[PDB]
Design an enzyme around this catalytic site. Structure first.
Site, PDB file in Angstrom:
ATOM      1  N   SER A  87      37.164  38.987  47.802  1.00  8.95           N
ATOM      2  CA  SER A  87      37.305  38.913  49.264  1.00  8.95           C
ATOM      3  C   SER A  87      36.095  38.232  49.848  1.00  8.95           C
ATOM      4  O   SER A  87      34.963  38.639  49.560  1.00  8.95           O
ATOM      5  CB  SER A  87      37.372  40.316  49.825  1.00  8.95           C
ATOM      6  OG  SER A  87      38.358  41.080  49.310  1.00  8.95           O
ATOM      7  N   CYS A 260      40.873  48.328  52.598  1.00  8.18           N
ATOM      8  CA  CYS A 260      40.419  47.384  51.559  1.00  8.18           C
ATOM      9  C   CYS A 260      39.460  48.131  50.632  1.00  8.18           C
ATOM     10  O   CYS A 260      38.627  48.946  51.060  1.00  8.18           O
ATOM     11  CB  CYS A 260      39.762  46.173  52.216  1.00  8.18           C
ATOM     12  SG  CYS A 260      39.408  44.796  51.088  1.00  8.18           S
ATOM     13  N   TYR A 302      42.757  46.781  45.189  1.00  8.77           N
ATOM     14  CA  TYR A 302      42.744  46.096  43.884  1.00  8.77           C
ATOM     15  C   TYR A 302      42.153  46.915  42.772  1.00  8.77           C
ATOM     16  O   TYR A 302      41.731  48.070  42.967  1.00  8.77           O
ATOM     17  CB  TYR A 302      41.978  44.772  44.052  1.00  8.77           C
ATOM     18  CG  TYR A 302      40.712  44.877  44.852  1.00  8.77           C
ATOM     19  CD1 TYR A 302      39.554  45.370  44.291  1.00  8.77           C
ATOM     20  CD2 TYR A 302      40.654  44.519  46.175  1.00  8.77           C
ATOM     21  CE1 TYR A 302      38.356  45.483  44.987  1.00  8.77           C
ATOM     22  CE2 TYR A 302      39.492  44.621  46.927  1.00  8.77           C
ATOM     23  CZ  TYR A 302      38.346  45.102  46.314  1.00  8.77           C
ATOM     24  OH  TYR A 302      37.193  45.231  47.063  1.00  8.77           O
TER      25      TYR A 302
HETATM   26  C1  LIG Z   1      42.639  40.371  46.369  1.00  7.54           C
HETATM   27  C2  LIG Z   1      41.470  40.854  45.531  1.00  7.54           C
HETATM   28  C3  LIG Z   1      40.287  40.961  46.093  1.00  7.54           C
HETATM   29  C4  LIG Z   1      39.160  41.435  45.383  1.00  7.54           C
HETATM   30  N1  LIG Z   1      37.931  41.531  46.062  1.00  7.54           N
HETATM   31  C5  LIG Z   1      36.871  42.027  45.301  1.00  7.54           C
HETATM   32  C6  LIG Z   1      35.621  42.078  45.926  1.00  7.54           C
HETATM   33  O1  LIG Z   1      35.387  41.771  47.126  1.00  7.54           O
HETATM   34  N2  LIG Z   1      34.578  42.522  45.158  1.00  7.54           N
HETATM   35  C7  LIG Z   1      34.797  42.874  43.872  1.00  7.54           C
HETATM   36  O2  LIG Z   1      33.757  43.287  43.236  1.00  7.54           O
HETATM   37  N3  LIG Z   1      35.957  42.806  43.316  1.00  7.54           N
HETATM   38  C8  LIG Z   1      36.981  42.359  44.041  1.00  7.54           C
HETATM   39  N4  LIG Z   1      38.193  42.205  43.417  1.00  7.54           N
HETATM   40  C9  LIG Z   1      38.248  42.570  41.902  1.00  7.54           C
HETATM   41  C10 LIG Z   1      37.954  41.281  41.102  1.00  7.54           C
HETATM   42  O3  LIG Z   1      38.957  40.298  41.234  1.00  7.54           O
HETATM   43  C11 LIG Z   1      37.826  41.564  39.615  1.00  7.54           C
HETATM   44  O4  LIG Z   1      39.023  42.215  39.132  1.00  7.54           O
HETATM   45  C12 LIG Z   1      36.640  42.454  39.235  1.00  7.54           C
HETATM   46  O5  LIG Z   1      35.437  41.832  39.690  1.00  7.54           O
HETATM   47  C13 LIG Z   1      36.514  42.670  37.704  1.00  7.54           C
HETATM   48  O6  LIG Z   1      36.585  41.351  37.086  1.00  7.54           O
HETATM   49  P1  LIG Z   1      35.679  41.042  35.840  1.00  7.54           P
HETATM   50  O7  LIG Z   1      35.943  39.644  35.422  1.00  7.54           O
HETATM   51  O8  LIG Z   1      34.290  41.417  36.081  1.00  7.54           O
HETATM   52  O9  LIG Z   1      36.207  42.068  34.732  1.00  7.54           O
HETATM   53  P2  LIG Z   1      37.275  41.724  33.557  1.00  7.54           P
HETATM   54  O10 LIG Z   1      36.594  40.909  32.525  1.00  7.54           O
HETATM   55  O11 LIG Z   1      38.520  41.215  34.205  1.00  7.54           O
HETATM   56  O12 LIG Z   1      37.457  43.191  32.938  1.00  7.54           O
HETATM   57  C14 LIG Z   1      38.275  44.124  33.696  1.00  7.54           C
HETATM   58  C15 LIG Z   1      37.721  45.533  33.383  1.00  7.54           C
HETATM   59  O13 LIG Z   1      38.015  45.804  31.976  1.00  7.54           O
HETATM   60  C16 LIG Z   1      36.783  46.418  31.442  1.00  7.54           C
HETATM   61  N5  LIG Z   1      36.873  46.163  29.978  1.00  7.54           N
HETATM   62  C17 LIG Z   1      36.786  44.933  29.354  1.00  7.54           C
HETATM   63  N6  LIG Z   1      36.836  45.116  28.045  1.00  7.54           N
HETATM   64  C18 LIG Z   1      37.148  46.430  27.870  1.00  7.54           C
HETATM   65  C19 LIG Z   1      37.396  47.212  26.663  1.00  7.54           C
HETATM   66  N7  LIG Z   1      37.559  46.672  25.471  1.00  7.54           N
HETATM   67  N8  LIG Z   1      37.445  48.555  26.805  1.00  7.54           N
HETATM   68  C20 LIG Z   1      37.337  49.137  28.025  1.00  7.54           C
HETATM   69  N9  LIG Z   1      37.136  48.503  29.169  1.00  7.54           N
HETATM   70  C21 LIG Z   1      37.021  47.187  29.020  1.00  7.54           C
HETATM   71  C22 LIG Z   1      35.672  45.733  32.153  1.00  7.54           C
HETATM   72  O14 LIG Z   1      34.456  46.493  32.051  1.00  7.54           O
HETATM   73  C23 LIG Z   1      36.220  45.749  33.576  1.00  7.54           C
HETATM   74  O15 LIG Z   1      36.003  46.983  34.208  1.00  7.54           O
HETATM   75  C24 LIG Z   1      39.289  41.768  44.148  1.00  7.54           C
HETATM   76  C25 LIG Z   1      40.538  41.645  43.601  1.00  7.54           C
HETATM   77  C26 LIG Z   1      41.613  41.216  44.326  1.00  7.54           C
HETATM   78  C27 LIG Z   1      42.914  41.033  43.681  1.00  7.54           C
END
Ligand SMILES: Cc1cc2nc3c(=O)[nH]c(=O)nc-3n(C[C@H](O)[C@H](O)[C@H](O)COP(=O)(O)OP(=O)(O)OC[C@H]3O[C@@H](n4cnc5c(N)ncnc54)[C@H](O)[C@@H]3O)c2cc1C
Ligand code: NA
Length: 302
Positions: A87, A260, A302
């Site tokens: 966001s 949100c 989310y």
């Molecule tokens: C409309 C929308 C708006 C958003 N706005 C925000 C925002 O303003 N701020 C924000 O911080 N996020 C926001 N998000 C969430 C964001 O898009 C991501 O989903 C979030 O930051 C996590 O992505 P990542 O790539 O860090 O984790 P990813 O790599 O996608 O991992 C997802 C989760 O899986 C866990 N994981 C990975 N491997 C494993 C495993 N083997 N065992 C256990 N757990 C594991 C990771 O630690 C993590 O918690 C928003 C999402 C949406 C859809």
């Protein structure tokens, strides 16, 4: 006292931009700054990231940017990583008041073994750690903007807006409130009521608190602000309940209400709203259906 913003031609578009840049050819933006928003007792880090898009990726308040973190897609050989959405936490003018930057409010996703607490870098969240680890001058692959659910309805500049956030869910509201109160936007003079409710874990986990507190002094007749600290006090729904009669009266009068943050916030809020309604002798189901029919109910979780 409002801050001059430029360029005013950002007000001229009649529709929000959508999908200006797509995943196969993202815009290569540049990091301006990254700073932690939280103190030492916060359960994890949430950072504020300022990104220079050069004016090439304009947006409206309430939209999201996509970010493609580096590396291969682990599920799809030799493919890029999937987009993660964030966001936008800035106004369309951004934190430098120039239409060239946007900001994100990013929670680091860190894995801890539930028994032992041991870390594993292969299990942390890729994009959130990428972003919070970034430094000035780093490049980021930006897509979007996208989304319309959280656009600010501006047809009535005297509307009421009740904003319910947990954690990073504060992001769109930071943008709404700067547009309403901080920036000199001559075509949008807000004279309604904006009411922000923010739930976080503890005082060290508060996000942008000095900014919101300043609005209480600058716009006392147009802004209200309530916080819920789950570990210290209390969830955001408990604060809604504290103000239930005021809130229900504002909803009946046409107020918009926004939610949100992480989706886990919504069951407790729905439970509280049902109980409040019952005590008033109302059906929450009937009331929610009417709010949705009237386009008063806005949720991006989310
Ligand atoms: C409309 C929308 C708006 C958003 N706005 C925000 C925002 O303003 N701020 C924000 O911080 N996020 C926001 N998000 C969430 C964001 O898009 C991501 O989903 C979030 O930051 C996590 O992505 P990542 O790539 O860090 O984790 P990813 O790599 O996608 O991992 C997802 C989760 O899986 C866990 N994981 C990975 N491997 C494993 C495993 N083997 N065992 C256990 N757990 C594991 C990771 O630690 C993590 O918690 C928003 C999402 C949406 C859809
Ligand atoms: Na703080």
């Amino acid at each position: 006292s409002k801050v001059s913003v430029a360029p005013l031609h950002l007000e001229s578009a009649k529709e929000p931009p959508l999908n200006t840049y797509k995943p196969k050819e993202p815009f290569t933006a540049t990091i301006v700054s990254v700073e932690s928003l939280v103190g030492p007792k916060a359960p994890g880090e949430t950072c504020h990231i300022v990104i220079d898009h050069g004016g090439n990726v304009p947006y409206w308040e309430g939209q999201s940017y996509g970010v493609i973190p580096p590396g291969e897609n682990p599920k799809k050989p030799g493919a890029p990583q999937n987009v993660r959405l964030y966001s936008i936490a800035s106004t369309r003018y951004g934190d430098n008041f120039d239409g060239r930057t946007g900001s994100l409010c990013v929670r680091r996703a860190v894995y801890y073994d539930p028994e032992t607490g041991k870390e594993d870098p292969s299990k942390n969240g890729v994009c959130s750690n990428f972003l919070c680890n970034s430094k000035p001058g780093d490049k980021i692959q930006l897509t979007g903007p996208s989304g319309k659910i959280m656009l600010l309805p501006e047809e009535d500049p005297n509307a009421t807006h009740i904003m319910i956030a947990t954690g990073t869910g504060v992001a769109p509201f930071r943008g709404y409130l700067r547009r309403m109160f901080m920036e000199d936007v001559p075509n949008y003079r807000f004279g309604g009521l904006a009411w922000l409710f923010l739930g976080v874990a503890n005082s060290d986990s508060l996000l942008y608190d000095e900014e919101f507190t300043s609005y209480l002094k600058q716009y006392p007749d147009n802004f209200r602000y309530d916080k819920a600290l789950s570990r210290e006090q209390m969830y955001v729904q408990d604060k809604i309940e504290e103000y239930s009669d005021e809130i229900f009266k504002l909803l009946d009068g046409g107020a918009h209400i926004y939610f949100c943050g992480l989706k886990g916030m919504m069951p407790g809020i729905q439970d509280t709203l049902k109980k409040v309604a019952e005590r008033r002798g109302e059906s929450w189901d009937q009331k929610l259906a009417q709010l949705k029919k009237n386009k008063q109910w806005h949720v991006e979780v989310y």
